[PDB]
Amino acid sequence: ECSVDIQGNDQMQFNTNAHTVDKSCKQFTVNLSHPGNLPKNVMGHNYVLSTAADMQGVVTDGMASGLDKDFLKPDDSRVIAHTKLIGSGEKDSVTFDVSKLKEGEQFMFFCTFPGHSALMKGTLTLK
Ligand SMILES: [Cu+2]
């Protein structure tokens, strides 16, 4: 009860816009996959986690940081956890410590590829 599977597709969609993390999990695992046909250079996706209020800046700086940095600013302390940027036929998992989430905050997940974040975003709720 401490993982979730998510897909990103060739139509710039995740197949969820919300998941939970139970507060009794010590670690939580996100398993991202790209079952499309377009490569990462034109339709790459990542799962990037931050507070809801930090998502905009993570995205802005990330899009400006280069494909070769997976569209994340180096040493961006607002990023709680993330997967790699993946393309067709690839998958990547991230396991993180739930202690990184505070029960007082609200959290969102998103993709930082150029143009994808307003389409590819969702809520993570710690319950
Ligand atoms: Cu994307």
Side-chain angles (χ1 to χ4, degrees):
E1 45 160 327
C2 303
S3 70
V4 70
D5 297 354
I6 303 181
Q7 299 171 203
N9 70 16
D10 279 342
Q11 300 289 318
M12 295 179 42
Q13 306 169 299
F14 290 128
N15 67 339
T16 182
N17 47 45
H19 72 89
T20 61
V21 175
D22 195 291
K23 292 173 65 146
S24 71
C25 291
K26 298 312 293 331
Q27 63 166 228
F28 187 83
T29 300
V30 172
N31 300 305
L32 185 69
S33 65
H34 191 324
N37 302 104
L38 292 173
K40 168 183 72 179
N41 304 90
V42 303
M43 193 54 65
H45 306 309
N46 55 11
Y47 173 103
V48 183
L49 180 68
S50 72
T51 64
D54 277 340
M55 164 179 172
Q56 186 183 0
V58 170
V59 167
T60 297
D61 291 338
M63 293 189 302
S65 294
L67 193 272
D68 72 355
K69 302 196 186 329
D70 277 10
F71 295 113
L72 291 169
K73 182 182 72 146
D75 314 299
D76 193 338
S77 54
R78 297 168 296 189
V79 175
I80 294 166
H82 68 93
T83 69
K84 292 171 32 257
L85 190 75
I86 60 175
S88 163
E90 300 181 332
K91 62 182 168 43
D92 191 48
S93 309
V94 55
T95 298
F96 66 91
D97 286 331
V98 176
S99 63
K100 295 184 159 280
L101 304 171
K102 166 76 168 204
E103 187 249 295
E105 267 288 1
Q106 290 187 315
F107 308 103
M108 291 170 76
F109 66 89
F110 50 92
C111 180
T112 60
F113 195 94
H116 290 199
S117 65
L119 295 176
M120 297 189 70
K121 67 190 181 312
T123 58
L124 180 164
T125 305
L126 185 300
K127 57 156 186 78

mmCIF file with all atom_site columns, all heavy atoms in Angstrom, residues 103-124:
data_model
loop_
_atom_site.group_PDB
_atom_site.id
_atom_site.type_symbol
_atom_site.label_atom_id
_atom_site.label_alt_id
_atom_site.label_comp_id
_atom_site.label_asym_id
_atom_site.label_entity_id
_atom_site.label_seq_id
_atom_site.pdbx_PDB_ins_code
_atom_site.Cartn_x
_atom_site.Cartn_y
_atom_site.Cartn_z
_atom_site.occupancy
_atom_site.B_iso_or_equiv
_atom_site.pdbx_formal_charge
_atom_site.auth_seq_id
_atom_site.auth_comp_id
_atom_site.auth_asym_id
_atom_site.auth_atom_id
_atom_site.pdbx_PDB_model_num
ATOM 1   N N   . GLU A 1 103 ? 2.496  16.591 6.675   1.00 0.00 ? 103 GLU A N   1
ATOM 2   C CA  . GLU A 1 103 ? 1.069  16.669 6.796   1.00 0.00 ? 103 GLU A CA  1
ATOM 3   C C   . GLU A 1 103 ? 0.537  18.146 6.747   1.00 0.00 ? 103 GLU A C   1
ATOM 4   O O   . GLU A 1 103 ? -0.597 18.328 6.285   1.00 0.00 ? 103 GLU A O   1
ATOM 5   C CB  . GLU A 1 103 ? 0.548  15.860 7.984   1.00 0.00 ? 103 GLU A CB  1
ATOM 6   C CG  . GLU A 1 103 ? -1.004 15.786 8.025   1.00 0.00 ? 103 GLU A CG  1
ATOM 7   C CD  . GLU A 1 103 ? -1.591 16.575 9.188   1.00 0.00 ? 103 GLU A CD  1
ATOM 8   O OE1 . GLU A 1 103 ? -1.315 16.174 10.351  1.00 0.00 ? 103 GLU A OE1 1
ATOM 9   O OE2 . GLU A 1 103 ? -2.349 17.565 8.946   1.00 0.00 ? 103 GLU A OE2 1
ATOM 10  N N   . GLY A 1 104 ? 1.310  19.185 7.098   1.00 0.00 ? 104 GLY A N   1
ATOM 11  C CA  . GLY A 1 104 ? 0.666  20.480 6.802   1.00 0.00 ? 104 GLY A CA  1
ATOM 12  C C   . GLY A 1 104 ? 0.596  20.949 5.372   1.00 0.00 ? 104 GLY A C   1
ATOM 13  O O   . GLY A 1 104 ? -0.267 21.778 5.062   1.00 0.00 ? 104 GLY A O   1
ATOM 14  N N   . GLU A 1 105 ? 1.473  20.439 4.514   1.00 0.00 ? 105 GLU A N   1
ATOM 15  C CA  . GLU A 1 105 ? 1.520  20.936 3.119   1.00 0.00 ? 105 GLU A CA  1
ATOM 16  C C   . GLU A 1 105 ? 0.514  20.336 2.132   1.00 0.00 ? 105 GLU A C   1
ATOM 17  O O   . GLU A 1 105 ? -0.121 19.323 2.400   1.00 0.00 ? 105 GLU A O   1
ATOM 18  C CB  . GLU A 1 105 ? 2.923  20.830 2.618   1.00 0.00 ? 105 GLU A CB  1
ATOM 19  C CG  . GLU A 1 105 ? 3.700  22.137 2.852   1.00 0.00 ? 105 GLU A CG  1
ATOM 20  C CD  . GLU A 1 105 ? 3.258  23.299 1.903   1.00 0.00 ? 105 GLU A CD  1
ATOM 21  O OE1 . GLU A 1 105 ? 2.318  23.224 1.016   1.00 0.00 ? 105 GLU A OE1 1
ATOM 22  O OE2 . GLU A 1 105 ? 3.912  24.359 2.051   1.00 0.00 ? 105 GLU A OE2 1
ATOM 23  N N   . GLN A 1 106 ? 0.392  20.933 0.929   1.00 0.00 ? 106 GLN A N   1
ATOM 24  C CA  . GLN A 1 106 ? -0.212 20.313 -0.227  1.00 0.00 ? 106 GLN A CA  1
ATOM 25  C C   . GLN A 1 106 ? 0.810  20.226 -1.365  1.00 0.00 ? 106 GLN A C   1
ATOM 26  O O   . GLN A 1 106 ? 1.687  21.050 -1.524  1.00 0.00 ? 106 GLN A O   1
ATOM 27  C CB  . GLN A 1 106 ? -1.500 20.961 -0.649  1.00 0.00 ? 106 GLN A CB  1
ATOM 28  C CG  . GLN A 1 106 ? -2.606 20.650 0.407   1.00 0.00 ? 106 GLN A CG  1
ATOM 29  C CD  . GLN A 1 106 ? -3.941 21.128 -0.050  1.00 0.00 ? 106 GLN A CD  1
ATOM 30  O OE1 . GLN A 1 106 ? -4.026 22.265 -0.551  1.00 0.00 ? 106 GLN A OE1 1
ATOM 31  N NE2 . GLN A 1 106 ? -4.991 20.288 0.078   1.00 0.00 ? 106 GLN A NE2 1
ATOM 32  N N   . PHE A 1 107 ? 0.608  19.138 -2.094  1.00 0.00 ? 107 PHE A N   1
ATOM 33  C CA  . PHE A 1 107 ? 1.624  18.620 -3.033  1.00 0.00 ? 107 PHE A CA  1
ATOM 34  C C   . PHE A 1 107 ? 1.030  18.403 -4.414  1.00 0.00 ? 107 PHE A C   1
ATOM 35  O O   . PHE A 1 107 ? -0.130 18.032 -4.570  1.00 0.00 ? 107 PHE A O   1
ATOM 36  C CB  . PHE A 1 107 ? 2.247  17.263 -2.567  1.00 0.00 ? 107 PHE A CB  1
ATOM 37  C CG  . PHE A 1 107 ? 2.754  17.356 -1.164  1.00 0.00 ? 107 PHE A CG  1
ATOM 38  C CD1 . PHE A 1 107 ? 2.000  16.798 -0.137  1.00 0.00 ? 107 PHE A CD1 1
ATOM 39  C CD2 . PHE A 1 107 ? 3.926  18.020 -0.875  1.00 0.00 ? 107 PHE A CD2 1
ATOM 40  C CE1 . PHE A 1 107 ? 2.421  16.894 1.216   1.00 0.00 ? 107 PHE A CE1 1
ATOM 41  C CE2 . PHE A 1 107 ? 4.330  18.087 0.467   1.00 0.00 ? 107 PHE A CE2 1
ATOM 42  C CZ  . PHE A 1 107 ? 3.512  17.561 1.476   1.00 0.00 ? 107 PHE A CZ  1
ATOM 43  N N   . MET A 1 108 ? 1.820  18.651 -5.424  1.00 0.00 ? 108 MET A N   1
ATOM 44  C CA  . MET A 1 108 ? 1.420  18.301 -6.792  1.00 0.00 ? 108 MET A CA  1
ATOM 45  C C   . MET A 1 108 ? 2.570  17.581 -7.477  1.00 0.00 ? 108 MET A C   1
ATOM 46  O O   . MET A 1 108 ? 3.757  17.763 -7.203  1.00 0.00 ? 108 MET A O   1
ATOM 47  C CB  . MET A 1 108 ? 1.062  19.514 -7.652  1.00 0.00 ? 108 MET A CB  1
ATOM 48  C CG  . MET A 1 108 ? -0.196 20.220 -7.258  1.00 0.00 ? 108 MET A CG  1
ATOM 49  S SD  . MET A 1 108 ? -0.466 21.803 -8.092  1.00 0.00 ? 108 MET A SD  1
ATOM 50  C CE  . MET A 1 108 ? -0.992 21.075 -9.688  1.00 0.00 ? 108 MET A CE  1
ATOM 51  N N   . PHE A 1 109 ? 2.196  16.719 -8.388  1.00 0.00 ? 109 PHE A N   1
ATOM 52  C CA  . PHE A 1 109 ? 3.065  16.027 -9.312  1.00 0.00 ? 109 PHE A CA  1
ATOM 53  C C   . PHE A 1 109 ? 2.855  16.610 -10.717 1.00 0.00 ? 109 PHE A C   1
ATOM 54  O O   . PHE A 1 109 ? 1.705  17.043 -11.050 1.00 0.00 ? 109 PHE A O   1
ATOM 55  C CB  . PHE A 1 109 ? 2.962  14.513 -9.290  1.00 0.00 ? 109 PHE A CB  1
ATOM 56  C CG  . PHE A 1 109 ? 1.650  13.977 -9.746  1.00 0.00 ? 109 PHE A CG  1
ATOM 57  C CD1 . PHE A 1 109 ? 1.438  13.694 -11.125 1.00 0.00 ? 109 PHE A CD1 1
ATOM 58  C CD2 . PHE A 1 109 ? 0.655  13.693 -8.846  1.00 0.00 ? 109 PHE A CD2 1
ATOM 59  C CE1 . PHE A 1 109 ? 0.258  13.146 -11.577 1.00 0.00 ? 109 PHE A CE1 1
ATOM 60  C CE2 . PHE A 1 109 ? -0.564 13.157 -9.320  1.00 0.00 ? 109 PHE A CE2 1
ATOM 61  C CZ  . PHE A 1 109 ? -0.732 12.909 -10.676 1.00 0.00 ? 109 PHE A CZ  1
ATOM 62  N N   . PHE A 1 110 ? 3.829  16.591 -11.582 1.00 0.00 ? 110 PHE A N   1
ATOM 63  C CA  . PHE A 1 110 ? 3.749  17.181 -12.905 1.00 0.00 ? 110 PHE A CA  1
ATOM 64  C C   . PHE A 1 110 ? 4.915  16.718 -13.765 1.00 0.00 ? 110 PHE A C   1
ATOM 65  O O   . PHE A 1 110 ? 5.954  16.249 -13.258 1.00 0.00 ? 110 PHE A O   1
ATOM 66  C CB  . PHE A 1 110 ? 3.688  18.702 -12.773 1.00 0.00 ? 110 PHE A CB  1
ATOM 67  C CG  . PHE A 1 110 ? 4.770  19.259 -11.871 1.00 0.00 ? 110 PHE A CG  1
ATOM 68  C CD1 . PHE A 1 110 ? 5.990  19.682 -12.357 1.00 0.00 ? 110 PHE A CD1 1
ATOM 69  C CD2 . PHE A 1 110 ? 4.526  19.357 -10.504 1.00 0.00 ? 110 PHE A CD2 1
ATOM 70  C CE1 . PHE A 1 110 ? 6.978  20.146 -11.506 1.00 0.00 ? 110 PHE A CE1 1
ATOM 71  C CE2 . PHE A 1 110 ? 5.523  19.797 -9.641  1.00 0.00 ? 110 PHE A CE2 1
ATOM 72  C CZ  . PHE A 1 110 ? 6.700  20.204 -10.130 1.00 0.00 ? 110 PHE A CZ  1
ATOM 73  N N   . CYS A 1 111 ? 4.777  16.969 -15.058 1.00 0.00 ? 111 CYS A N   1
ATOM 74  C CA  . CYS A 1 111 ? 5.839  16.818 -16.027 1.00 0.00 ? 111 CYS A CA  1
ATOM 75  C C   . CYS A 1 111 ? 6.452  18.162 -16.370 1.00 0.00 ? 111 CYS A C   1
ATOM 76  O O   . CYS A 1 111 ? 5.698  19.135 -16.511 1.00 0.00 ? 111 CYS A O   1
ATOM 77  C CB  . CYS A 1 111 ? 5.256  16.179 -17.243 1.00 0.00 ? 111 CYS A CB  1
ATOM 78  S SG  . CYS A 1 111 ? 6.514  15.933 -18.583 1.00 0.00 ? 111 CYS A SG  1
ATOM 79  N N   . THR A 1 112 ? 7.797  18.237 -16.459 1.00 0.00 ? 112 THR A N   1
ATOM 80  C CA  . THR A 1 112 ? 8.414  19.519 -16.785 1.00 0.00 ? 112 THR A CA  1
ATOM 81  C C   . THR A 1 112 ? 8.864  19.651 -18.282 1.00 0.00 ? 112 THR A C   1
ATOM 82  O O   . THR A 1 112 ? 9.505  20.638 -18.617 1.00 0.00 ? 112 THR A O   1
ATOM 83  C CB  . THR A 1 112 ? 9.666  19.798 -15.891 1.00 0.00 ? 112 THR A CB  1
ATOM 84  O OG1 . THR A 1 112 ? 10.634 18.738 -16.100 1.00 0.00 ? 112 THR A OG1 1
ATOM 85  C CG2 . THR A 1 112 ? 9.301  19.908 -14.440 1.00 0.00 ? 112 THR A CG2 1
ATOM 86  N N   . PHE A 1 113 ? 8.538  18.650 -19.103 1.00 0.00 ? 113 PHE A N   1
ATOM 87  C CA  . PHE A 1 113 ? 8.861  18.834 -20.532 1.00 0.00 ? 113 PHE A CA  1
ATOM 88  C C   . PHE A 1 113 ? 8.136  20.122 -21.017 1.00 0.00 ? 113 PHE A C   1
ATOM 89  O O   . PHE A 1 113 ? 6.989  20.349 -20.705 1.00 0.00 ? 113 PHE A O   1
ATOM 90  C CB  . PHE A 1 113 ? 8.424  17.624 -21.287 1.00 0.00 ? 113 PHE A CB  1
ATOM 91  C CG  . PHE A 1 113 ? 8.993  17.490 -22.667 1.00 0.00 ? 113 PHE A CG  1
ATOM 92  C CD1 . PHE A 1 113 ? 10.108 16.758 -22.852 1.00 0.00 ? 113 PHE A CD1 1
ATOM 93  C CD2 . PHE A 1 113 ? 8.414  18.181 -23.733 1.00 0.00 ? 113 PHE A CD2 1
ATOM 94  C CE1 . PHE A 1 113 ? 10.682 16.591 -24.162 1.00 0.00 ? 113 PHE A CE1 1
ATOM 95  C CE2 . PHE A 1 113 ? 9.056  18.096 -25.042 1.00 0.00 ? 113 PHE A CE2 1
ATOM 96  C CZ  . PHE A 1 113 ? 10.185 17.207 -25.215 1.00 0.00 ? 113 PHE A CZ  1
ATOM 97  N N   . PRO A 1 114 ? 8.807  20.921 -21.879 1.00 0.00 ? 114 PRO A N   1
ATOM 98  C CA  . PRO A 1 114 ? 8.177  22.104 -22.444 1.00 0.00 ? 114 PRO A CA  1
ATOM 99  C C   . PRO A 1 114 ? 6.750  21.876 -22.957 1.00 0.00 ? 114 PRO A C   1
ATOM 100 O O   . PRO A 1 114 ? 6.502  20.981 -23.737 1.00 0.00 ? 114 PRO A O   1
ATOM 101 C CB  . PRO A 1 114 ? 9.103  22.593 -23.534 1.00 0.00 ? 114 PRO A CB  1
ATOM 102 C CG  . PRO A 1 114 ? 10.489 22.174 -22.958 1.00 0.00 ? 114 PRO A CG  1
ATOM 103 C CD  . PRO A 1 114 ? 10.220 20.836 -22.302 1.00 0.00 ? 114 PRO A CD  1
ATOM 104 N N   . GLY A 1 115 ? 5.813  22.708 -22.437 1.00 0.00 ? 115 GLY A N   1
ATOM 105 C CA  . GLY A 1 115 ? 4.438  22.620 -22.943 1.00 0.00 ? 115 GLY A CA  1
ATOM 106 C C   . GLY A 1 115 ? 3.542  21.592 -22.249 1.00 0.00 ? 115 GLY A C   1
ATOM 107 O O   . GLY A 1 115 ? 2.366  21.478 -22.625 1.00 0.00 ? 115 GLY A O   1
ATOM 108 N N   . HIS A 1 116 ? 4.118  20.718 -21.383 1.00 0.00 ? 116 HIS A N   1
ATOM 109 C CA  . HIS A 1 116 ? 3.313  19.562 -20.846 1.00 0.00 ? 116 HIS A CA  1
ATOM 110 C C   . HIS A 1 116 ? 2.713  19.877 -19.531 1.00 0.00 ? 116 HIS A C   1
ATOM 111 O O   . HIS A 1 116 ? 1.661  19.305 -19.247 1.00 0.00 ? 116 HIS A O   1
ATOM 112 C CB  . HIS A 1 116 ? 4.221  18.349 -20.676 1.00 0.00 ? 116 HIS A CB  1
ATOM 113 C CG  . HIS A 1 116 ? 4.687  17.748 -21.940 1.00 0.00 ? 116 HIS A CG  1
ATOM 114 N ND1 . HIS A 1 116 ? 5.176  16.444 -21.968 1.00 0.00 ? 116 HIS A ND1 1
ATOM 115 C CD2 . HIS A 1 116 ? 4.701  18.236 -23.214 1.00 0.00 ? 116 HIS A CD2 1
ATOM 116 C CE1 . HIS A 1 116 ? 5.522  16.180 -23.236 1.00 0.00 ? 116 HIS A CE1 1
ATOM 117 N NE2 . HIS A 1 116 ? 5.250  17.255 -23.994 1.00 0.00 ? 116 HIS A NE2 1
ATOM 118 N N   . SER A 1 117 ? 3.249  20.785 -18.730 1.00 0.00 ? 117 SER A N   1
ATOM 119 C CA  . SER A 1 117 ? 2.802  20.844 -17.258 1.00 0.00 ? 117 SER A CA  1
ATOM 120 C C   . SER A 1 117 ? 1.408  21.188 -17.038 1.00 0.00 ? 117 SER A C   1
ATOM 121 O O   . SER A 1 117 ? 0.779  20.609 -16.119 1.00 0.00 ? 117 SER A O   1
ATOM 122 C CB  . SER A 1 117 ? 3.703  21.746 -16.468 1.00 0.00 ? 117 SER A CB  1
ATOM 123 O OG  . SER A 1 117 ? 3.622  23.133 -16.911 1.00 0.00 ? 117 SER A OG  1
ATOM 124 N N   . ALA A 1 118 ? 0.816  22.089 -17.821 1.00 0.00 ? 118 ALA A N   1
ATOM 125 C CA  . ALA A 1 118 ? -0.582 22.441 -17.501 1.00 0.00 ? 118 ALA A CA  1
ATOM 126 C C   . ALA A 1 118 ? -1.502 21.301 -17.884 1.00 0.00 ? 118 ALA A C   1
ATOM 127 O O   . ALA A 1 118 ? -2.630 21.201 -17.285 1.00 0.00 ? 118 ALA A O   1
ATOM 128 C CB  . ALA A 1 118 ? -0.990 23.683 -18.215 1.00 0.00 ? 118 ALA A CB  1
ATOM 129 N N   . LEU A 1 119 ? -1.120 20.439 -18.828 1.00 0.00 ? 119 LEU A N   1
ATOM 130 C CA  . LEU A 1 119 ? -1.879 19.272 -19.172 1.00 0.00 ? 119 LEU A CA  1
ATOM 131 C C   . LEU A 1 119 ? -1.574 18.095 -18.133 1.00 0.00 ? 119 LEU A C   1
ATOM 132 O O   . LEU A 1 119 ? -2.453 17.361 -17.513 1.00 0.00 ? 119 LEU A O   1
ATOM 133 C CB  . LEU A 1 119 ? -1.487 18.985 -20.649 1.00 0.00 ? 119 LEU A CB  1
ATOM 134 C CG  . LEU A 1 119 ? -1.887 20.028 -21.756 1.00 0.00 ? 119 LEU A CG  1
ATOM 135 C CD1 . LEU A 1 119 ? -1.354 19.663 -23.116 1.00 0.00 ? 119 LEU A CD1 1
ATOM 136 C CD2 . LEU A 1 119 ? -3.420 20.130 -21.791 1.00 0.00 ? 119 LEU A CD2 1
ATOM 137 N N   . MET A 1 120 ? -0.322 17.976 -17.820 1.00 0.00 ? 120 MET A N   1
ATOM 138 C CA  . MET A 1 120 ? 0.219  16.797 -17.080 1.00 0.00 ? 120 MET A CA  1
ATOM 139 C C   . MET A 1 120 ? 0.564  17.209 -15.642 1.00 0.00 ? 120 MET A C   1
ATOM 140 O O   . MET A 1 120 ? 1.736  17.465 -15.369 1.00 0.00 ? 120 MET A O   1
ATOM 141 C CB  . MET A 1 120 ? 1.426  16.283 -17.845 1.00 0.00 ? 120 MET A CB  1
ATOM 142 C CG  . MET A 1 120 ? 0.983  15.792 -19.267 1.00 0.00 ? 120 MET A CG  1
ATOM 143 S SD  . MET A 1 120 ? 2.381  14.922 -20.093 1.00 0.00 ? 120 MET A SD  1
ATOM 144 C CE  . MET A 1 120 ? 2.453  13.456 -19.103 1.00 0.00 ? 120 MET A CE  1
ATOM 145 N N   . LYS A 1 121 ? -0.444 17.196 -14.828 1.00 0.00 ? 121 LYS A N   1
ATOM 146 C CA  . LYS A 1 121 ? -0.263 17.620 -13.427 1.00 0.00 ? 121 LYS A CA  1
ATOM 147 C C   . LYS A 1 121 ? -1.323 16.972 -12.636 1.00 0.00 ? 121 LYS A C   1
ATOM 148 O O   . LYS A 1 121 ? -2.414 16.574 -13.126 1.00 0.00 ? 121 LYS A O   1
ATOM 149 C CB  . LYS A 1 121 ? -0.282 19.090 -13.190 1.00 0.00 ? 121 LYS A CB  1
ATOM 150 C CG  . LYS A 1 121 ? -1.640 19.745 -13.442 1.00 0.00 ? 121 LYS A CG  1
ATOM 151 C CD  . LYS A 1 121 ? -1.528 21.282 -13.423 1.00 0.00 ? 121 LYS A CD  1
ATOM 152 C CE  . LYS A 1 121 ? -2.910 21.877 -13.661 1.00 0.00 ? 121 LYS A CE  1
ATOM 153 N NZ  . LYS A 1 121 ? -3.680 21.311 -14.784 1.00 0.00 ? 121 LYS A NZ  1
ATOM 154 N N   . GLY A 1 122 ? -1.152 16.830 -11.327 1.00 0.00 ? 122 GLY A N   1
ATOM 155 C CA  . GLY A 1 122 ? -2.110 16.209 -10.445 1.00 0.00 ? 122 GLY A CA  1
ATOM 156 C C   . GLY A 1 122 ? -1.764 16.479 -9.001  1.00 0.00 ? 122 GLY A C   1
ATOM 157 O O   . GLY A 1 122 ? -0.740 17.064 -8.699  1.00 0.00 ? 122 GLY A O   1
ATOM 158 N N   . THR A 1 123 ? -2.573 15.958 -8.115  1.00 0.00 ? 123 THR A N   1
ATOM 159 C CA  . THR A 1 123 ? -2.389 16.141 -6.653  1.00 0.00 ? 123 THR A CA  1
ATOM 160 C C   . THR A 1 123 ? -1.856 14.872 -6.003  1.00 0.00 ? 123 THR A C   1
ATOM 161 O O   . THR A 1 123 ? -2.196 13.734 -6.403  1.00 0.00 ? 123 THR A O   1
ATOM 162 C CB  . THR A 1 123 ? -3.693 16.532 -5.951  1.00 0.00 ? 123 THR A CB  1
ATOM 163 O OG1 . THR A 1 123 ? -4.646 15.539 -6.198  1.00 0.00 ? 123 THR A OG1 1
ATOM 164 C CG2 . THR A 1 123 ? -4.200 17.858 -6.556  1.00 0.00 ? 123 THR A CG2 1
ATOM 165 N N   . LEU A 1 124 ? -0.935 15.043 -5.052  1.00 0.00 ? 124 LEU A N   1
ATOM 166 C CA  . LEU A 1 124 ? -0.570 13.944 -4.162  1.00 0.00 ? 124 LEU A CA  1
ATOM 167 C C   . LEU A 1 124 ? -1.092 14.350 -2.783  1.00 0.00 ? 124 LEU A C   1
ATOM 168 O O   . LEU A 1 124 ? -0.753 15.454 -2.293  1.00 0.00 ? 124 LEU A O   1
ATOM 169 C CB  . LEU A 1 124 ? 0.958  13.731 -4.165  1.00 0.00 ? 124 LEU A CB  1
ATOM 170 C CG  . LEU A 1 124 ? 1.497  12.591 -3.254  1.00 0.00 ? 124 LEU A CG  1
ATOM 171 C CD1 . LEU A 1 124 ? 2.882  12.260 -3.640  1.00 0.00 ? 124 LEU A CD1 1
ATOM 172 C CD2 . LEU A 1 124 ? 1.421  13.030 -1.755  1.00 0.00 ? 124 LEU A CD2 1
#
